[PDB]
């Protein structure tokens, strides 16, 4: 029911980091029109067509006042997390 957040208006509030409990966590700041559903994905390097972000937060959103937290699992190897156009490389251990 929400539109997708404008993919040009994200920056990192807390960059991708290890959560302890075998997941990857991150926070984003969004400066555009709210509320909206956060477009999030990830790819294995050299495999741009296949999303590999397995979302633990399955419907991340920016609300009128809050939102921005994303948790995912990723496969081992060199990955890139995208939140809209915002990216961050994430190497995942086996």
């Amino acid at each position: 029911t929400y539109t997708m957040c404008d993919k040009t208006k994200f920056t990192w509030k807390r960059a991708p980091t290890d959560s302890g409990h075998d997941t990857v966590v991150m926070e984003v700041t969004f400066s555009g029109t709210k509320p909206c559903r956060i477009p999030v994905r990830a790819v294995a390097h050299g495999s741009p067509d296949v999303n590999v972000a397995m979302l633990i937060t399955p419907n991340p959103t920016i609300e009128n006042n809050g939102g921005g937290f994303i948790e995912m699992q990723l496969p081992p190897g060199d990955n890139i997390i995208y939140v809209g156009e915002l990216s961050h490389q994430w190497f995942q251990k086996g």
Epitope: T3, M4, D6, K7, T8, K9, S31, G32, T33, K34, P35, C36, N64, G84
Partner: antibody, heavy 120, light 108 residues
């Protein structure tokens, strides 16, 4: 360079239907959100609908929700507004408006507008 | 939804003088506030986005400021082409909402 040409305006009887289009040139249409704004004779500007660059996202003003459908053909660089169940108070100049980004306002470029007159 | 109010409805200023236009939001819209100019019989034109950033090809006598619920547009040294209707628009929250406009007319 950037041009937005609307067409499809005209007279339509109450309760019937109209499709507007807006042909874009001079920019990469498929990278940008597009909006419809309307302006009744002598009144202020009135936001109608938005569609994201990739057509996945649409939103409507409350006064037209459930009656209007916005869509776009990115291989034809064309934006559409399908207007059903038209009322006299839908009479307005309708503008297509480009977003500088993927979906959000503001509106950086505007068409010249097309006149919709809902009347018997 | 957010209600955008502009004040005053009409402003009469002489050429060369300064015009200050106000825009009020019923709740905070941060800095996601735009200003448009519309001359009689023409499409509107973007002037200001992000509350204070000038759009391209907008001259420097247009400036704007504000955040949250109060915004002003200032036109310094009104030139005859500056006389028109000005609309604010919040785009912090869907649906984006225009204010009702302020007519800037030439005082004589």
């Amino acid at each position: 360079q950037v041009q937005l040409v609307e067409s499809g305006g005209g007279v339509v009887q109450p309760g019937r239907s109209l499709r507007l289009s807006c042909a874009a040139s001079g920019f990469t249409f498929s990278n940008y959100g597009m909006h419809w704004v309307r302006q009744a004779p002598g009144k202020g500007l009135d936001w109608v609908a938005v569609i994201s660059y990739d057509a996945i996202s649409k939103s409507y003003a409350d006064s037209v929700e459930g009656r209007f459908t916005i869509s776009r053909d990115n291989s034809k660089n064309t934006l559409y507004l399908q207007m059903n169940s038209l009322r006299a108070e839908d009479s307005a100049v309708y503008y297509c408006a480009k977003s500088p980004t993927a979906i959000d306002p503001p509106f950086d470029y505007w068409g010249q507008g097309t006149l919709v007159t809902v009347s018997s | 939804e957010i209600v955008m109010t502009q004040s005053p409805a009409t402003l009469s200023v002489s050429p060369g003088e300064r015009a200050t236009l106000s825009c009020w939001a019923s709740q905070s819209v941060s800095s996601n506030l735009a200003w448009y100019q519309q001359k009689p019989g023409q499409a509107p034109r973007l002037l200001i986005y992000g509350a204070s950033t000038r759009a391209t090809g907008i001259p420097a006598r247009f400036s704007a400021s504000g955040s949250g619920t109060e915004f002003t547009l200032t036109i310094s040294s009104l030139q005859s082409e500056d006389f028109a209707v000005y609309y604010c628009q919040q785009y912090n929250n869907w649906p984006p909402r225009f204010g009702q406009g302020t007519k800037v007319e030439i005082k004589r």
